[PDB]
C-alpha cells in the first residue's frame, strides 16, 4: 500500500526532504511561503497507496499606490502586502467622496483579489 512522492504545491514546500517511496500511514507537512495562507490540512497521509488532498497557498495582495492615486484614495493609517483574510482601510482624499457603486473603504484581501474603493470629486 505504499505511496510515491508527495505532490508539489505553488508557493510552498514540505517541511521534510522528499522520498521516492513512503510507507502506509506515513505523513508529511507543507508550509507556504511568507504571507501566503495555507488552506486545507497541512498534513497529508498515505492511505491505500494514495496521498490525501494537499493544501493550497492562498495569495496575498499587493497594495498599489498607482491605483490608489487613480481612484482618489489613501491609506487611513500607515505595508505593501496584505495576507489573505487581512484587511486594509482606505479614506477618500480630501474633496472627494465615495462613488455610488463603490466598494467599502475597509476591504479585505482574498487569495490575491483586493477590491479598491473609488472616490469621486465632490
Amino acid at each position: 500500500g505504499k505511496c510515491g512522492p508527495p505532490p508539489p504545491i505553488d508557493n510552498g514546500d514540505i517541511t521534510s526532504f522528499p522520498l521516492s517511496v513512503y510507507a502506509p500511514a506515513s505523513s508529511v507537512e507543507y508550509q507556504c511561503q511568507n504571507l501566503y495562507q495555507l488552506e486545507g490540512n497541512k498534513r497529508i497521509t498515505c492511505r491505500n497507496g494514495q496521498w490525501s488532498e494537499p493544501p493550497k497557498c492562498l495569495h496575498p495582495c499587493v497594495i498599489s499606490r498607482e491605483i490608489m492615486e487613480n481612484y482618489n484614495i489613501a491609506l487611513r493609517w500607515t505595508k505593501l502586502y496584505s495576507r489573505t483574510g487581512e484587511s486594509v482601510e482606505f479614506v477618500c482624499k480630501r474633496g472627494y467622496r465615495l462613488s455610488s457603486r463603490s466598494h467599502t473603504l475597509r476591504t479585505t484581501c482574498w487569495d490575491g483579489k483586493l477590491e479598491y474603493p473609488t472616490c469621486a470629486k465632490r
Binding site: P8, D10, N11, G12, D13, F17, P18, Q31, C32, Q33, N34, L35, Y36, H59, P60, V62, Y81
Partner: protein
C-alpha cells in the same frame, strides 16, 4: 595570476558564524582557482592536501552556527541573517567538489531562504544584518538594496540548483519569482554594482536580453569594467560579476578587455573587507579559464 602571489589566501579559519566564513572564503576560492588553472604541480601538489583540510575545518566550524531552522547567524542566539545564510550557500556550493558537503545543510539553508525570507513580489529581505558589514562587499550601504540583495540571494539559489532542485521543489518557482522582480526593475537601476550583480543573476536564467542586455553592456566604462565612485574593491567585485554574466551569455567578443582590466588590477585578495572581491574575482577568472578557447 600566479600561485605564489596567492599563497597567503591559504589560511586557518576562526571566529564565530561570520568571521569563520571570512576566513573560509579565501582558501576555498584559492583551491578552486588553482585547480582550474592547474597550477598545483609547480606550486607544490603536497600543499593541496593541507588546503582541503583547512576547508573541511571551515565547513565543520561553520556547522556550530547552523540554527535549528537551517539558517546561520554570527551566534546561535542572534536572529538569522538572510545575507549570511545565502553566503554560506554560495560558498558551500562552490566547495561541493572539494570536500563532502551535507546536502541537508545546504538545501536546508536554501529552503529556509525560500519559505521565510522571500516576499510575494520575489524580493529577498534581510531582517538581521550581519555585524561585520565589511564582508558583504558592494552591497554595503547600497540604496538599491532590494535589487542588490535579491540578486545576491538569487545567485546563491542558482548556484545551489543542481544540488538541491530535487530535494527542494519550491526552488525553481522561487528562482523565477526573484527573476521577475529583477527583470521588472532592472532598467531603472543607476549603480553599476547593482547592474552587474543583477545582470549575472538574470543571465543565469537566460533573462538578460534585449534592452536589459544592452543596459548591462552599455553601463561598462570603456567596454572593460563596471565601476562606481567609491571603494575600488566594490568595482573589482562588480566587474567580476559582469564577467560571469558575459560568460553565461557566451559573448566571448566582449570578454577579453574585461579580463585584461581585472588582470591589470593585480588584485591578489585577502585584506580588510575583501571577502566579496576575493571570492568573486577568482570565481570569475576561474570560470573564464574553464570556458575560454
Amino acid at each position: 595570476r600566479d600561485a605564489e602571489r596567492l599563497k597567503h589566501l591559504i589560511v586557518t579559519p576562526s571566529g564565530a558564524g561570520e568571521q569563520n566564513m571570512i576566513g573560509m572564503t579565501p582558501t576555498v576560492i584559492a583551491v578552486h582557482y588553482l585547480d582550474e588553472t592547474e597550477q598545483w604541480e609547480k606550486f607544490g601538489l603536497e600543499k593541496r592536501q593541507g588546503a582541503l583540510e583547512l576547508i573541511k575545518k571551515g565547513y565543520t566550524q561553520q556547522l556550530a552556527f547552523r540554527q535549528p531552522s537551517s539558517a546561520f547567524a554570527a551566534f546561535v542566539k542572534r536572529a538569522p541573517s538572510t545575507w549570511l545564510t545565502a553566503y554560506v550557500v554560495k560558498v558551500f556550493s562552490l566547495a561541493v567538489n572539494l570536500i563532502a558537503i551535507d546536502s541537508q545543510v545546504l538545501c536546508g539553508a536554501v529552503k529556509w531562504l525560500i519559505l521565510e525570507k522571500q516576499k510575494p513580489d520575489g524580493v529577498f529581505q534581510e531582517d538581521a544584518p550581519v555585524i561585520h558589514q565589511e564582508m558583504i562587499g558592494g552591497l554595503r550601504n547600497n540604496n538599491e538594496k532590494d535589487m542588490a540583495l535579491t540578486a545576491f540571494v538569487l545567485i546563491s539559489l542558482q548556484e545551489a540548483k543542481d544540488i538541491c532542485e530535487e530535494q527542494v521543489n519550491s526552488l525553481p518557482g522561487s528562482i523565477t519569482k526573484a527573476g521577475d522582480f529583477l527583470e521588472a526593475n532592472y532598467m531603472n537601476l543607476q549603480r553599476s554594482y547593482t547592474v552587474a550583480i543583477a545582470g549575472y543573476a538574470l543571465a543565469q536564467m537566460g533573462r538578460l536580453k534585449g534592452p536589459l542586455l544592452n543596459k548591462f553592456l552599455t553601463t561598462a566604462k570603456d567596454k572593460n569594467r563596471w565601476e562606481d565612485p567609491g571603494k575600488q574593491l566594490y568595482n573589482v567585485e562588480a566587474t567580476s560579476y559582469a564577467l560571469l554574466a558575459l560568460l553565461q551569455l557566451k559573448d566571448f567578443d566582449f570578454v577579453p578587455p574585461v579580463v585584461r582590466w581585472l588582470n591589470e588590477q593585480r588584485y591578489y585578495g585577502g585584506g580588510y573587507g575583501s571577502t566579496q572581491a576575493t571570492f568573486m574575482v577568482f570565481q570569475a577568472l576561474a570560470q573564464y579559464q574553464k570556458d575560454a578557447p
